[PDB]
């Protein structure tokens, strides 16, 4: 089920997708887009879109191998996504324009910020 291309290639300039929480390097989002969301986010080939759709501020990682048979994937709401590395919590928000466009297409946006705040 899993693809090696999805896995972060190194630990520098890691970012997490604000829509699905997938973690890859910035160059990998540029090169391949988001493995889960790119039909909707279309960041492949566009660094500016990568900066808008992903965040360098995230907490923890999860190497998700069998999302279909994991308790962790259920808690993290990633059970329908591809095997890959995911952030435990992501700081940030998709731009309003992208959220509105997602909504018009039948995609809801629920924040990947899971942090307990204060």
């Amino acid at each position: 089920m899993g693809a090696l291309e999805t896995v972060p290639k190194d630990l520098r300039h890691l970012r997490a997708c604000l829509l699905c929480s997938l973690v890859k390097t910035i160059d990998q989002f540029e090169y391949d887009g988001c493995d889960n969301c790119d039909a909707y986010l279309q960041m492949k080939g566009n660094r500016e879109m990568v900066y808008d759709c992903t965040s360098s501020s995230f907490d923890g990682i999860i190497a998700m191998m069998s999302p279909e048979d994991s308790w962790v994937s259920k808690w993290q709401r990633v059970s329908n996504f591809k095997p890959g590395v995911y952030a435990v919590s992501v700081t940030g928000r998709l731009p309003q324009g992208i959220v509105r466009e997602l909504k018009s297409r039948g995609v809801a946006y629920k924040s990947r910020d899971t942090a307990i705040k204060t």
Partner: protein, 95 residues
């Protein structure tokens, strides 16, 4: 049914790298007769000196981490995370 979480001693400061290495290992073996049977690995932001491995059986963890240098001091024993504490593994607090 749902699997358990197990702690595995890990070379300090190498937790993130090791989780990513196990992701690659899982993918590497997925079309072989010796696949990894673990379900996930968690490296929480501020944890030092171990990682968490999700599996139905402890033996699956041992089998997955065999040969992984950073986990060599965690090879003989893994401790189960008490079920009541499983969401604390994934807790993030921001002041």
């Amino acid at each position: 049914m749902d699997p358990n979480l197990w702690t595995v001693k890990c070379k300090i400061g190498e937790e993130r790298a090791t989780a990513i290495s196990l992701m690659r290992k899982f993918i590497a073996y997925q079309f072989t007769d010796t696949p990894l049977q673990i379900k996930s690995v968690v490296a929480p932001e501020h944890v030092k000196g171990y990682i968490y491995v999700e599996a139905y059986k402890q033996t699956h963890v041992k089998q997955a981490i065999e040969g992984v240098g950073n986990l060599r001091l965690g090879y003989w024993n893994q401790q189960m995370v008490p079920i009541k504490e499983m969401t604390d593994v994934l807790k993030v607090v921001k002041e």
